[PDB]
Design a protein around this ligand. Structure first.
Ligand SMILES: CO[C@H]1O[C@H](CO[C@H]2O[C@H](CO)[C@@H](O)[C@H](O)[C@@H]2O[C@@H]2O[C@H](CO)[C@@H](O)[C@H](O)[C@H]2NC(C)=O)[C@@H](O[C@@H]2O[C@H](CO)[C@@H](O)[C@H](O)[C@H]2NC(C)=O)[C@H](O[C@H]2O[C@H](CO)[C@@H](O)[C@H](O)[C@@H]2O[C@@H]2O[C@H](CO)[C@@H](O)[C@H](O)[C@H]2NC(C)=O)[C@@H]1O
Ligand code: CA
Length: 128
């Protein structure tokens, strides 16, 4: 019950934007054109579902932003739950890196703060 090329997970459909790279704002615009938004992750189940679908050579924007002074906020305004975050060791690390990607390292998948202007792949999400 998800559209062609989207992957279902419980109440949502997920799209892995692999065909091109874009800035955070451009990525959110692409998701928006499909009636979706950059992914908002509320559990390890969701995190692990998403990473199972990703290329280890690529980085993927998610819908998490530093609103100021390391105040992480989801783009759909749902609460940032400190009990379900997946930062890489040593991340987040830099004030001018206000956007977040999922990327892969020797220690596995995780989140890293990066500059919003840096072009990456992304994951879109929409309710079924
Ligand atoms: C060694 O890692 C640290 O430095 C990286 C920058 O390295 C350049 O600058 C240093 C001097 O400061 C120099 O010693 C290096 O040789 C290198 O020089 C540059 O080389 C390139 C050719 O590759 C050349 O074109 C440049 O002219 C030349 N510049 C200079 C000044 O000599 C840094 O990596 C950078 O990260 C930023 C985002 O902050 C990104 O825009 C840059 O593209 C990227 N540059 C390179 C070369 O990779 C490292 O920062 C990483 O890793 C940190 C953890 O150690 C993370 O916290 C950071 O968030 C950042 O993560 C990366 O973010 C990009 C986002 O675009 C993402 O694609 C990657 O997957 C991700 N990597 C990881 C490991 O998460 C770090 O400070
Ligand atoms: Ca970082």
């Amino acid at each position: 019950s998800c559209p062609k090329d989207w992957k279902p997970f419980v109440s949502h459909c997920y799209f892995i934007l692999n065909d091109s790279k874009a800035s955070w704002n451009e990525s959110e615009e692409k998701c928006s054109h499909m009636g979706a938004h950059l992914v908002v992750i509320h559990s390890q189940a969701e995190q692990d579902f998403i990473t199972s679908n990703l290329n280890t050579s690529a980085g993927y924007f998610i819908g998490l932003l530093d609103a100021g002074q390391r105040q992480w906020r989801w783009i759909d305004q749902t609460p940032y739950n400190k009990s379900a975050t997946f930062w890489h060791k040593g991340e987040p690390n830099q004030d001018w890196e206000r956007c977040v990607i999922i990327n892969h390292k020797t220690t596995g998948w995780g989140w890293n703060d990066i500059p919003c202007k840096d072009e990456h792949n992304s994951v879109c999400q929409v309710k079924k």
